[PDB]
Design a binder for these strands. Structure first.
Lengths: 143, 50, 262, 206, 64
RNA sequence: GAAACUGCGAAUGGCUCAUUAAAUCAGUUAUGGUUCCUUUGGUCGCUCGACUUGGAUAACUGUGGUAAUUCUAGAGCUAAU
RNA sequence: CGCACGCCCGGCGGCGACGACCCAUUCGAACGUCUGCCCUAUCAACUUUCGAUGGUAGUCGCCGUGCCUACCAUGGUGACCACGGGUGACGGGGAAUCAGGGUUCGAUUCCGGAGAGGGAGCCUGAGAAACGGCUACCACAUCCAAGGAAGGCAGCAGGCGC
């Protein structure tokens, strides 16, 4: 279920060999009024790079795109849309900038089209520098 | 092949020029900082090692 | 750049020094010290340009190498030593004492003080800290580390230190309704009473300040210095008392004094 | 020499960067330590800021910790069994961080016996004939014996551990970078970690 | 890197049409009546006035 | 007070624009992801176990090399933050 | 290491200089975040099993990171112009011209970058991939008792060539 990779997966802060006679979990509220979600506290997954149950601090920018692709491992591509303003012609032009962002297995079901809020962290991989912090289900999507 | 020959405890030294082959024929195929007897060099150099 | 830089060109020199263009290529790059390069007043600048005691950098050298000038009760034989905000410059042979606090405009005024006032200074605490034995530690705006302080003093307060012992006498808490001089930004040298503090988690908190004449202005929390409890400053202020009247008022006052002279 | 830079390799889009400056120093990189098991050998590398950095090229000893009761002792590394990254690092048995080693169980046994006054390993019909082991296991006053009988209550060792003790060699995981600090410090494997790794060693072995 | 100004400025503007009879006649009557040395000394005073009028206009457009 | 050993500086300054097209650079923020001579201020009987130790080297003295250079080999004497 | 020389029965200490593991501070540096650049479709698809985008554990580095190892996953970018090509392209503050819009310039004294004939590699140091430092090769080139020795003006002057 977990421990698929060759090395033993554990939250390295919690010690799980206390002599006696459930496993505990390390987490944190990551500030800026983000509710440390229920799956963070009551999951049994392991993640270095989860902002709740891992070693990444959120600091700097808080941006938001729409989920575009979910085809890579614990990572997603969001699409950020904005209007760049040309000066000569007093009009705008529709631009975009899609970034690879780290999705924790905490947020169990996100659908491509969902609205995401992302917090800047340290560089996680070659192109990943942001973390998914809250998901807002796209217009309706009840049934 | 001139010889810069120095006596330490005295603290005196002299350049002594050589043009006899046989005298130098011993010194060849030695390495630096090896004591070698100068008994052969000349009759004033008798029982001397340099 | 392959290492630290040592020359500062005259055009790159901070504007509040009011250095003229056609004198040279360079300005005195301030030697490293308690205050920042940008926000200090080098001892050569204060002594030669402001007071006009010396004429050249060699004359300032000839003064400062006779141990005459004393910055914060210690002799400073470095002509480009950074003398910054609240710093107390006592010259004994002349019998004169200056505290470097800002003019109402964004520059350092040359404000003379009494022998008894030139014995202490106000230091803005920057970070509180615990050492290597649960020994509490302060760090002030002028790079002073004070250990075993008063257990109530916190990160944005002001402390009065003595320039012999270097120990904390009395302190002013950072509260609403406390006098603050603004020591950075557009409102540089404005004195006023703290009206509000507006918390922004992750960003720089902005603080609303009220001038005597009902002039309201905001500044980032970093560029504020609590210089008094209530309306009572624990130091002496320059003439003007940090109001920064408008350009139309400064004109009116100038040609009022002019026409009065006649 | 060995460059450690991002500008040498393709952009996010698969487009090539043309390098706008030659190799800088702070973009440094040195050969791998490749720490073997043998008599202590440590070379020193002078690094940025004039600080030091110790290259353990051979190591015998190591500061290992039995975590369940805070019993850490300097023991003697004997060999390596399994490495998660690469299996040539087993063949040319290199000491890297988070590799599984076997250590000498003797200082843990000596503490266990002297703490609990109970035998560990020491197979049924053990001739304890030097009998200063019997000194460590017997001969006390009244109230001291009450303290020792109080304590032997919670000395129930995991059978997985008790086998390794009796065999005379324990499994440990290296928790320190030995190629950078010159130390093979770690912790003794226990519980779910030990069952995971004992399966992995047996499975790979075949 | 030297201790010099390099802040110079022209104080006159040459007129667009070089041979307008009415403009030649206008400027000579100023030169003769006031004893100017050449046309430039008239174009100089035109330029100073043109600047003052521009600053007046640019302030007069601003709401009271 | 020459010389020489030691310490520091020589990474700044000056010159040119060949490279380089999200590169450089500009505004804006991050180091809670680092290193830092110098300065200023803290620390420096916090540790439970000789009223000053050691053998070399330079300048110096002398003996030399090859045509040649800011090349330097050999000997005897003596210092340290 | 240097000045002042002291205070009782052979007793008895102030100013400074220099040095130092660690801490903060000052000077920075370094790698990141968001948005922003000229012409080109006679450049429409590009990147990858010798790193292309991700996961785990290491290695290395001052540190975060495919930076690089090993084993896994099939990804990343593109008509909102990717990938490729061209520039008599170092970027910016700025400059010329102007009714209001704009067009063209910005090698050039201030800030930032890169280079020292072309590439590459390093010693020392807090800081250098330094060139008025060293070590090679490529091009050029000086002095030779012919064995060898020594080079680097896009520093200030100045010479040839153009």
């Amino acid at each position: 279920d977990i421990q698929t990779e060759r090395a033993y997966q554990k939250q390295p802060t919690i010690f799980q060999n206390k002599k006696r006679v459930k496993l505990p979990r390390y987490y944190k509220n990551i500030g800026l009024g983000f509710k440390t979600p229920k799956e963070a506290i009551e999951g049994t997954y392991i993640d270095k790079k989860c902002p709740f149950t891992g070693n990444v601090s959120i600091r700097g920018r808080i941006l938001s795109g729409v989920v575009t692709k979910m085809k890579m491992q614990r990572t997603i591509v969001i699409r950020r849309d904005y209007l760049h303003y040309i000066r000569k012609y007093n009009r705008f032009e529709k631009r975009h900038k899609n970034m690879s962002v780290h999705l924790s297995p905490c947020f169990r079901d996100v659908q491509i089209g969902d609205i995401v809020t992302v917090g800047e962290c340290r560089p996680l991989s070659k192109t990943v520098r942001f973390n998914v912090l809250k998901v807002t289900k796209a217009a309706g999507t009840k049934k | 092949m001139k010889l810069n020959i120095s006596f330490p405890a005295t603290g005196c030294q002299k350049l002594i020029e050589v043009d006899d082959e046989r005298k130098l024929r011993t010194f060849y195929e030695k390495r630096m900082a090896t004591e070698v007897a100068a008994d052969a060099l000349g009759e004033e150099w008798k029982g001397y090692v340099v | 750049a392959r290492g630290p830089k040592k020359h500062l060109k005259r055009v790159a020199a901070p504007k509040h020094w009011m250095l003229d263009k056609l004198t040279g290529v360079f300005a005195p790059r301030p030697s490293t010290g308690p205050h920042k390069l940008r926000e200090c007043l080098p001892l050569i600048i204060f002594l030669r340009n402001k007071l006009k005691y010396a004429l050249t950098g060699d004359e300032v050298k000839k003064i400062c190498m006779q141990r005459f000038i004393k910055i914060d009760g210690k002799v400073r034989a470095d002509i480009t030593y950074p003398a910054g905000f609240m710093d107390v410059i006592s010259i004994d042979k002349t019998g004169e004492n200056f505290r470097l606090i800002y003019d109402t405009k964004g520059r350092f005024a040359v404000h003379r003080i009494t022998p008894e006032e030139a014995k202490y200074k106000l230091c803005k605490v920057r970070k509180i800290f615990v050492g290597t034995k649960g020994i509490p530690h302060l760090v002030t705006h002028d790079a002073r580390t004070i250990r075993y302080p008063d257990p109530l003093i916190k990160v944005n307060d002001t402390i009065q230190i003595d320039l012999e012992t270097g120990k904390i006498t009395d302190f002013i808490k950072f509260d609403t309704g406390n006098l603050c001089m603004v020591t950075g930004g557009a409102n540089l040298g404005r004195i006023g009473v703290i009206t509000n503090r507006e918390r922004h988690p992750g960003s720089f908190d902005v603080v609303h300040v009220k001038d005597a004449n009902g002039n309201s202005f905001a500044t980032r929390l970093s560029n504020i210095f609590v210089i008094g409890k209530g309306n009572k400053p624990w130091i002496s202020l320059p003439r003007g008392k940090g109001i920064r009247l408008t350009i139309a008022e400064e004109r009116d006052k100038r040609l009022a004094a002019k026409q009065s002279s006649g | 020499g060995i460059s450690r830079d991002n500008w040498h390799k393709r952009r996010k889009t698969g487009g090539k960067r043309k390098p706008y400056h030659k190799k800088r120093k702070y973009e440094l990189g040195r050969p791998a330590a490749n720490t073997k098991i043998g008599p202590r050998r440590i070379h020193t590398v002078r690094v940025r800021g004039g600080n030091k950095k110790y290259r353990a090229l051979r190591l015998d000893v190591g500061n290992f910790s039995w975590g369940s009761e805070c019993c850490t002792r300097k023991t003697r590394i004997i060999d390596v069994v399994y490495n998660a990254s690469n299996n040539e690092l087993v063949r040319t048995k290199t000491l890297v961080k988070n590799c599984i080693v076997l250590i000498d169980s003797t200082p843990y046994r000596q503490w266990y016996e002297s703490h609990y006054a109970l035998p560990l390993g020491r197979k049924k019909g053990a001739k304890l004939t030097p009998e200063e082991e019997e000194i460590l296991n017997k001969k006390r006053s009244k109230k001291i014996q009450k303290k020792y009988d109080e304590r032997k209550k919670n000395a129930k060792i995991s059978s997985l551990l008790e086998e390794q003790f009796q065999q005379g060699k324990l499994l440990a995981c290296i928790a320190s970078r030995p190629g950078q600090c010159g130390r093979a410090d770690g912790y003794v494997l226990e519980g779910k970690e030990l069952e995971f790794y004992l399966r992995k060693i047996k499975a790979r072995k075949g | 890197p030297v201790a010099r100004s390099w802040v110079c400025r022209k104080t006159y503007v040459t007129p667009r049409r070089p041979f307008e009879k009415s403009r030649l006649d206008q400027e000579l009557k100023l030169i003769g009546e006031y004893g100017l040395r050449n046309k430039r000394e008239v174009w100089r005073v035109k330029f100073t006035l043109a600047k003052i009028r521009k600053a007046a206009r640019e302030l007069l457009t601003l709401d009271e």
